[PDB]
Design a binder for this molecule. Structure first.
Ligand SMILES: N[C@@H](Cc1c[nH]c[nH+]1)C(=O)O
Ligand SMILES: [Cl-]
Ligand code: NA
Ligand code: NA
Length: 267
């Protein structure tokens, strides 16, 4: 298949070898669904809020299935939930996403991954992610793939909301990917170039984006909570941000590349 490096790059193998693989951590993938038929994917539960696509365990896009593979690669023992808020074409309404956030809160998810976003949000979308973080959920989002706009932030919503961890993409050499959105909202980087993960119908394929980068961070959160089940979302986020491997300027790199090994020992 594609060969990939991302799991090693964030130093997840260190935690796996100590017995920390994300067991009893609930991770909600708010995406195009998850193909649970994939032999490498073990999905704990699901809900679809896409009214024309009723099966959250069928992914007609393939984006949600790629997210799942990357999260389970980082946190093999995580309980993954398929929250379908995006259709086949990869687009959804903000009300579908809000319904998936509400579902994640109600069902005691530890982590939300939103591998999505647009250039504008809404009060109702901000209320939803703010409410999830108030409830103690770790919320992670792709920073966006809008490159640079001189002085302007190009970070998408929901990542642009202070409550949400905003993740940009680096390559295997820790260089910012030219597509990775920029701005003071940027928190951390993770592997986002040619990420090999699961695709529907038992396949594998590489994808580049801030979405695969956010998937590494959602996984890292689950590893941390499988060592520190007592930690608040506040402590989880602070551990990832404060032990990041410093790279370039924060506008481009935030705090740098997540190091889940370091994060799992933060004091
Ligand atoms: N003193 C730490 C507290 C902490 C524990 N775990 C995560 N954060 C900060 O900074
Ligand atoms: Cl369907
Ligand atoms: Na399966
Ligand atoms: Na944010």
């Amino acid at each position: 298949k594609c060969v990939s490096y991302g799991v090693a790059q964030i130093k997840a193998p260190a935690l796996h070898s100590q017995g920390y693989t994300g067991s009893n951590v609930k991770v909600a993938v708010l995406d195009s669904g998850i193909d649970s038929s994939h032999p490498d994917l073990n999905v704990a539960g699901g809900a679809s809020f896409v009214p024309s696509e009723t099966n959250p365990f069928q992914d007609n896009n393939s984006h949600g299935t790629h997210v799942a593979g990357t999260v389970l690669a980082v946190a093999p023992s995580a309980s993954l939930y398929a929250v379908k808020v995006l259709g086949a074409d990869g687009s959804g309404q903000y009300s579908w996403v809000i319904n998936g956030i509400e579902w994640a809160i109600a069902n005691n998810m530890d982590v939300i991954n939103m591998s999505l976003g647009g250039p504008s949000g809404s009060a109702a979308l901000k209320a939803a992610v703010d409410k999830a973080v108030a409830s103690g959920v770790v919320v992670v989002a792709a920073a966006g793939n809008s490159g640079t706009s001189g002085s302007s932030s190009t970070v998408s919503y929901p990542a642009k909301y202070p409550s949400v961890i905003a993740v940009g993409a680096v390559d295997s050499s820790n260089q910012r990917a030219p597509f990775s959105s920029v701005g003071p909202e940027l928190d951390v980087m993770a592997p986002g170039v040619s990420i090999c993960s699961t695709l529907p119908g038992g396949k594998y394929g590489a994808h580049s984006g801030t979405c695969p980068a956010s998937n590494h961070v959602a996984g890292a959160a689950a590893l941390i909570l499988s060592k520190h089940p007592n930690w608040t979302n506040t402590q989880v986020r602070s551990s990832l941000e404060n032990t990041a491997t410093k790279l370039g300027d924060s506008f481009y790199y935030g705090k740098g590349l997540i190091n889940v090994e370091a994060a799992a020992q933060h004091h």
